[PDB]
Amino acid sequence: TTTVGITLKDAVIMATERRVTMENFIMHKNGKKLFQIDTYTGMTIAGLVGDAQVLVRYMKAELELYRLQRRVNMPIEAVATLLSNMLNQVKYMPYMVQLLVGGIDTAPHVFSIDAAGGSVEDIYASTGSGSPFVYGVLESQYSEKMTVDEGVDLVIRAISAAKQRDSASGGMIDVAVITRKDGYVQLPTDQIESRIRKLGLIL
C-alpha cells in the first residue's frame, strides 16, 4: 500500500493507490483506501483491511454525530486525539493499521496515527509498504510554497515512484484535495489520468 498526505498554505492533498494483496497474490486492483470522514477531513488506511474499514465507519459516524451535537466540525487535532485514545485503549488487542488524518480547521493539518495510538502532526507524511519511496520524492521535491496544482502533481509523482518499486502497491492513483472553499473533494479519475500523461508517467 502507498498513501500520502501533504499540507500546503491553505490546503491538504491526500492520495493512495488501490492494490489489495495477500502475499504476492493481487486479489483486487481497485481497493479504496482514501475516505472523506467529515466536511473538511479525510483519512487514508494501511494495514489489515477489516480493521481499517471498521475504523472508517466509526469515524464517519462519530464525526457526523459530533458535528450535529456541537454545531461545528471536530477540530483536526481532536479527530487525531479521538483515534489516539481509541487505538491505545486496545493496544494489546489492536487495530492493525497505520492511519493518516488530514483536514482544515483554522489551519491545514496532517496527522500520522499508529496501531498503539501514537499520533504526530507533520507537514507531510506517508504510510504503507511504499512509503519510503514516497519519502524520497518528497524530501527531494516538496516545497511549502507549492500551489495546489503543483502539490497534486507531486503526490502523483511520489505514488507513481512507489508503484515502480513496491510490488504491494499498484492500480489507479486516487487523490483528494481539501479546502475551506470546497471542503473535501475527490479528484475525477480522468483528471488524474490526464496529469499522469502530461507528467510522462505509467498506469
Show which residues are catalytic: 1
Task: Give the C-alpha separation, 138 to 15, whole Å.
Answer: 13
**Whether the Cβ atoms of residue 47 and residue 115 lie closer than 8 Å to each other:** yes
Pick between residue 179 and residue 186 the one whose CB is nearest to a copy of itself.
Answer: 186
Pseudo-torsion of CA 119, 121, 126, 132, nearest 10°? Answer: -90
Chain positions 179 to 198 lying near a copy of itself, rule: CB under 8 A, are: none
Residues between 61 and 120 with contacts to a copy of itself, criterion CB under 8 A:
81, 84-85, 87-88, 91-93, 112, 114, 116-120
Residues 135 to 164: which contact a copy of itself by CB under 8 A? 135-137, 139-141, 157-158, 160-162, 164
Q: Which stretch binds a copy of itself (CB under 8 A): 27-35, 66-74, 172-180, 181-189?
A: 27-35
Angle between helices 131-141 and 148-165 (to 10 degrees): 140
3-state secondary structure of 56: helix
CB of 181 to a copy of itself, least distance (A): 28
| DSSP string for residues in 58-97 | HHHHHHHHHHHHHSSPPPHHHHHHHHHHHHHHTTTS---E
- List of residues contacting a copy of itself (CB under 8 A): 19-22, 24-32, 48-54, 57, 81, 84-85, 87-88, 91-93, 112, 114, 116-122, 125, 129, 132-137, 139-141, 157-158, 160-162, 164-168, 170
